């Protein structure tokens, strides 16, 4: 392949997994921001391997997961020339993150982005509800418009990212009504992704050669960590009350007070990068897919140097008191 | 021109060698203070024995390069004119054979 640079730093999802209309209406991908890498102790459950029922130490990558919010939908009708959106539907109240995304000079603009669109709910909704019933009627496939809570993130960019997600639940009408309830509300990955899920990662890699869109597939999610948990770094074996945040935090990133996904292996791109987490394009059954992993211990030490503790309470407990 | 700077350099050195040694020391003091003032002021003072000669040597070497190149280009022009005359002679000899 000719190595030309990426178009956008938010990499495109060129293909989505297959629509099952017998499952409830649910998302198919997510956009998070990778914090960094650490090392996880767990037990291997692999008969046929000599390392069966044996402690393995594994490199993982953790992506910060702010809860994503839906602000619009887009229905595509089939043409003999390809997919084409007949329209897009927006919600009324959109944040300055998203109105910032449309603008290049937000700091001096009069911020006039979706003003007259807000007059479209000043009415009963007749044009808007006509459009919703149109996307019920036409537009065989449905994509939803989502953006992240980037202010809840140590990113210096206050401008959140918008993306489309193909909605592979059932019933296009129930899909657009589902999105209609889910306008301006939130969706966490706990209703979308789960433990042991084989996911694919779509991300622009590290420029220096580089800065190319890459899709690395078949990565087992190891932890769907909740933001309210203070035992994010804990296990049933590791009974410390500690977070997933490293000692000193993630290097050049900040922290994760939000939800997070800890996934096996490595991933294209660097830290501070927008990464799409897509579920698998097929039902992998490789027994590397079916594995219900069970963690044991989480490294949360410093990568800012050769770390030697996990909690600072452990640090004071070993070092005792100081002169300071 | 560097020729003129070398002329002024030799004129300054002859004026210094003409005068008395105490006047020489005092004029060297005057020239070092005024020269430091003009240099730190911003006037690039360019008067050296070796450097002005080496600038002349570089200019002479460049002109020698130019002479070699132009002489060679004239030789190649004469070569091409001779070869085209040879071509036309051969065409005339073929047409004399026909």
């Amino acid at each position: 392949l000719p190595r030309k640079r990426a178009a956008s730093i938010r990499a495109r999802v060129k293909a989505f997994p297959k629509d099952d209309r017998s499952k409830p209406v649910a998302l198919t991908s997510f956009l998070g921001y990778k914090a960094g890498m650490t090392t996880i102790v767990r037990d291997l459950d692999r008969p046929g391997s000599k390392f069966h029922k044996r402690e393995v130490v594994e490199a993982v990558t953790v992506v910060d997961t702010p809860p994503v919010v839906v602000v619009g939908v887009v229905g595509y009708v089939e043409t003999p020339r390809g997919l084409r959106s007949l329209t897009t539907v927006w919600a009324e109240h959109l944040s300055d993150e998203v109105k910032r995304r449309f603008y290049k000079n937000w700091y001096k603009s009069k911020k006039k982005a979706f003003t007259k669109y807000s007059a479209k709910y000043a009415q009963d909704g007749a044009g808007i509800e006509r459009e919703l019933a149109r996307i019920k009627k036409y537009a065989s496939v449905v994509r939803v418009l989502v953006h992240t809570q980037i202010r809840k993130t140590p990113l210096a960019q206050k401008k959140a990212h918008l993306a489309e997600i193909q909605l592979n639940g059932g019933s296009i009408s129930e899909k657009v009504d589902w999105a209609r309830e889910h306008f301006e509300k939130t969706v966490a990955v706990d209703s979308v992704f789960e433990q042991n899920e084989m996911i694919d990662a779509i991300a622009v890699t590290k420029g220096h050669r580089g800065y190319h869109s890459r899709t690395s597939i078949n990565h087992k999610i190891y932890r769907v960590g909740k933001g309210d948990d203070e035992a994010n770094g804990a296990t049933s074996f590791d009974r410390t009350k500690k977070t997933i945040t490293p000692m000193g935090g993630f290097v050049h990133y900040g922290e994760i007070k939000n939800d997070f996904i800890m996934v096996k292996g490595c991933i294209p791109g660097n830290r501070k990068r927008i990464v799409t987490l897509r579920k698998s394009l097929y039902t992998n059954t490789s027994r590397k897919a079916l594995e219900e992993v069970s963690l044991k211990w989480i490294d949360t030490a410093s990568k800012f140097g050769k770390g030697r503790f996990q909690t600072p309470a452990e640090k004071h407990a070993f070092m005792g008191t100081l002169k300071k | 021109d560097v020729k003129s700077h070398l002329k002024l350099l030799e004129a300054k050195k002859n004026k210094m060698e003409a005068k008395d040694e105490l006047e020489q020391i005092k004029q060297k003091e005057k020239e070092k203070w005024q020269k430091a003032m003009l240099q730190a002021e911003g006037i690039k003072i360019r008067d050296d024995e070796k450097l002005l000669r080496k600038a002349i040597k570089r200019k002479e070497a460049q002109k020698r390069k130019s002479a070699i190149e132009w002489s060679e280009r004239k030789r190649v022009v004469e070569d091409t004119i001779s070869e085209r005359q040879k071509r036309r002679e051969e065409n005339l000899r073929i047409r004399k054979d026909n």
Binding site: - | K32, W33, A36, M37, Q39, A40, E41, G42, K44
Partner: protein, 225 residues
Amino acid sequence: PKSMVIRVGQTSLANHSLNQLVKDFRQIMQPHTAIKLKERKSNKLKDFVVMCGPLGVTHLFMFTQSEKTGNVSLKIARTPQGPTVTFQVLDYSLGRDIKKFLKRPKSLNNDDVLNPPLLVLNGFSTSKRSGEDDQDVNVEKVIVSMFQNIFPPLNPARTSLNSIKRVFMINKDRETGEISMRHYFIDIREVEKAIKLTELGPRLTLKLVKIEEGICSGKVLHHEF
């Protein structure tokens, strides 16, 4: 009329205190001499600035401390061939210490004071003889030319008097043998005048040492000890 600031030597680049002086001199000078994004200087390069610098800069500044004695030195240079002037420091002051000694609302931070500073010579020279040594008078006149020619030349009726913000003064008493460079940010009292001053950055005092060639240690032109 651009300018440089570098600390020369292992002892200089070893000192974190002298880095503060480097930062503050970078904050004092004009936008044309704003060397900024040259904070990270290298261990490898040692008098390597003279090869790439005079493509686009003049008037280099050197910091050096002797390995034997606990004294650190300023040198003032030209990137074309000229003189250098060697100075010992006196009473090095941290600008953050001037913060904590006296709190003043400073405009070093904002980009509104992205403007060149001005020239005040507090009796640095005497055109009169005043003594038996006229070479000292020549020293005074040459260094006057230095400070008026490091900064951009100001034929004053051409100059726009809107930008005043940075001002700079060199205090020379003849009996002390001491030159002191203290600069202030200006404030305007609009009375048709009256002008306030506030301290901004490093306050110093120097001592004349020697005059060499603009290439450092090239030709020692004047001794003063």
